[PDB]
Symmetry: C3
Subunit: 83 residues, 3 copies
């Protein structure tokens, strides 16, 4: 027998991509809501990252400085946001 854990993100619609940084913060592209949300390790409350003008964001990555990169699928671009 095994255990899987549902992360306490809220109000997701068609989540499309996930990244995890060195601190254990989890970042998710909430595709159907045109937004990117995150949850700190231990934290109970998701925060919405201040990207703008997203259309169907499809993927997310985070580098060693905590910069977050997102593929903005509907706008044919990749956007990044410093920590």
């Amino acid at each position: 027998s095994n255990t899987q854990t549902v992360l306490p993100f809220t109000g997701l619609n068609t989540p499309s991509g996930v990244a995890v940084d060195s601190a254990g913060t989890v970042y998710v592209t909430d595709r159907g809501n045109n937004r990117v949300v995150k949850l700190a390790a231990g934290s109970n409350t998701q925060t919405v990252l201040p990207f703008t003008g997203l259309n169907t964001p499809s993927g997310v990555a985070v580098d060693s400085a905590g910069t977050v990169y997102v593929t903005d699928r509907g706008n044919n671009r990749v956007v990044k946001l410093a920590a």
Copy 2:
């Protein structure tokens, strides 16, 4: 400039990939509602014991070998400890 096709089998619309420190490769096998992994060396493919996935879309693995999946069809994010 030679690419190598990995010995995964039975994939249907694979949607995401992650690789851990040991070189194990994890794939969200979206059309089969599962996540599979391929062990380095042995090339043994196993299905990760997630349950109730619907069109999983993205996967990540952290330094502790915890696997995170976006369970797209169920509007949730799930993880599985090593």
Copy 3:
């Protein structure tokens, strides 16, 4: 904070993204059947020499710089060494 747009060119439905320890950004340019990368500080992307992709959906990179891609339309996973 204010977002920055990376100087990729000609993307069509980019589907996935990874960044390695060197800050190189790798993107699956799904609608163009290709994978592109941008070195930190560069303004000119390079197209990785994969072959025969059909709607690549996700990308990962390991510590040796090997790039892994889910080639969604061909139900396979391919890799290319650095």
